[PDB]
């Protein structure tokens, strides 16, 4: 996270760290949606241009964390993956359209003060909150700068941007399964996700029922926190039918 701040303890209890077993490293962010399911970006698990194709045994899920590098004894929970499900129409060849994947854990994780699931939006949630100007929150242990690494989880609040502005900021083809967020050059404020944060959640707190909903997934961007560029996010509600199908079947 570039231009963000240190998260408070228990501020994002659904935060998940995808950790590579060997070599030991941060692979991506992710989120806890039930005691057995974790949501992330498809590109965190499959991206042929870079010969990335992780299988279940290649990584671990670390939940309840705050410190990036420390093994948080008596606090974090480490979980193994039973199966990975990547959206069948994920477009890694072109623009990362439908950048979403689910991971089923081998065993349910116990909830605690530091581990708790985030809600997924329904049609009404999306219509109510996904409006230009409304701010969401992104969290992660990724890079602090485009060109080090944080001691603890970082957080930044960012406004959703009008679709025409998002479209005009890039040569990449944008789809209805994406939205973009971030401040414009004339707004003065800054902030963006960066390497290490993708797959992580973009959440919003409903002012109607005071619950947090994951509206997006950190998907892509050109550089990090560059003026005139915006971060792009997978539109969770638009892909919810797929999410439900997978959980209902498996």
């Amino acid at each position: 996270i570039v231009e963000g701040s240190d998260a408070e303890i228990g501020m994002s209890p659904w935060q998940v760290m995808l950790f590579r077993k060997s070599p030991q490293e941060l692979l991506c962010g992710a989120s806890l949606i039930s005691d057995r399911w974790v949501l992330t970006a498809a590109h965190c698990l499959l991206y042929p241009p870079w010969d990335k194709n992780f299988t279940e045994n290649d990584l671990l899920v670390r939940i309840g964390k705050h410190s990036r590098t420390r093994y948080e004894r008596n606090i974090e929970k480490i979980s193994m993956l039973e199966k990975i499900y990547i959206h069948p129409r994920y477009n890694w060849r072109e623009n990362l359209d439908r950048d979403i994947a689910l991971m089923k854990l081998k065993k349910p994780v116990a909830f605690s003060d530091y581990i708790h699931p985030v809600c997924l939006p329904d049609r009404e949630t999306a219509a109510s909150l996904l409006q230009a100007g409304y701010k969401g929150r992104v969290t992660g242990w990724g890079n602090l700068k485009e060109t080090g690494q944080p001691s603890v989880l970082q957080v930044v609040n960012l406004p959703i941007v009008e679709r025409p502005v998002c479209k005009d900021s890039t040569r990449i083809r944008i789809t209805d399964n994406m939205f973009c967020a971030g401040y414009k050059p004339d707004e003065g404020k800054r902030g963006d996700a960066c390497e290490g944060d993708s797959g992580g959640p973009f959440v919003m707190k409903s002012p109607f029922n005071n619950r947090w909903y994951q509206m997006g997934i950190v998907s892509w961007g050109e550089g990090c926190d560059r003026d005139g560029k915006y971060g792009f996010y997978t539109h969770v509600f638009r892909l919810k039918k797929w999410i439900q199908k997978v959980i209902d079947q498996f």
């Binding site: 701040s5 949606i33 708790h116 985030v118 809600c119 701010k135 609040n157």
Partner: peptide, 27 residues
């Protein structure tokens, strides 16, 4: 049924340092 309600915040009616910035943007 309890999704999205944080044990250390919503559950005990405590607010985090910047959540009000989000609320203020929901005009």
């Amino acid at each position: 049924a309890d999704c999205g309600l944080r044990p250390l915040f919503e559950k005990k009616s405590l607010e985090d340092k910047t959540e009000r910035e989000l609320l203020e943007s929901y005009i």
